[PDB]
Design a protein around this nucleic acid. Structure first.
Ligand SMILES: [Zn+2]
Ligand SMILES: [Zn+2]
Ligand SMILES: [Zn+2]
Ligand SMILES: [Zn+2]
Lengths: 78, 76
DNA sequence: CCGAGGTCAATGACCTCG
DNA sequence: CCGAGGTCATTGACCTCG
């Protein structure tokens, strides 16, 4: 299909410089615009998939970053 | 226990069968507002803890085949 | 605890710009 | 066309109550 580098769902395009799905695109955008800080309530080593992505925001945001989604490209100044 | 519909962690029997918050929530809403869905493929979509939201039609049907019975759903 | 009902922040499919 | 930047109906974790 194509594959989101974060969760393995079907990617819809490159978002903030990384091939990702709509879910991760939006999760990334919200997390960054609000400068959210998450805390993994598990082992801080969650593996991402379509189930786990909803279960751990901290590990999902880290994966987003590790894969190349760029925070600085989220609503920059102009 | 486990949700008999998707394999997610269950926490009771809701509407007759060991099911998860999601499947229970989904079944309830489906009946309450009496919604009709349509499968964009056939009617054998996966439906598990990961893909359950890919087809509302197949999820509901699987709710039915797993024992979830209406009647257990009151309304407003 | 069980299992009906209810809530609502987060989620993600779909939409409109630039 | 793509992708940035939303919009908004649905999802499902968390509650209350008998
Ligand atoms: Zn994803
Ligand atoms: Zn985690
Ligand atoms: Zn389920
Ligand atoms: Zn289907």
């Amino acid at each position: 299909e194509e594959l989101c580098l974060v969760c393995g769902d079907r990617a819809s395009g490159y978002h903030y410089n990384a091939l990702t799905c709509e879910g991760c695109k939006g999760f990334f955008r919200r997390s960054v615009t609000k400068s959210a800080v998450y805390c993994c309530k598990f082992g801080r080593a969650c593996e991402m998939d379509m189930y786990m992505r909803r279960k751990c925001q901290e590990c999902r945001l880290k994966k987003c970053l590790a894969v190349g989604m760029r925070p600085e490209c989220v609503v920059p100044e102009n | 226990h486990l949700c008999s519909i998707c394999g997610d962690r269950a926490s009771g029997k809701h509407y007759g069968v060991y099911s998860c918050e999601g499947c229970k929530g989904f079944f309830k809403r489906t009946v309450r507002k009496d919604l009709t869905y349509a499968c964009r493929e056939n009617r054998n979509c996966i439906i598990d803890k990961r893909q359950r939201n890919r087809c509302q039609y197949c999820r509901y049907q699987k709710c039915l085949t797993c024992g979830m019975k209406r009647e257990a759903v009151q309304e407003e």
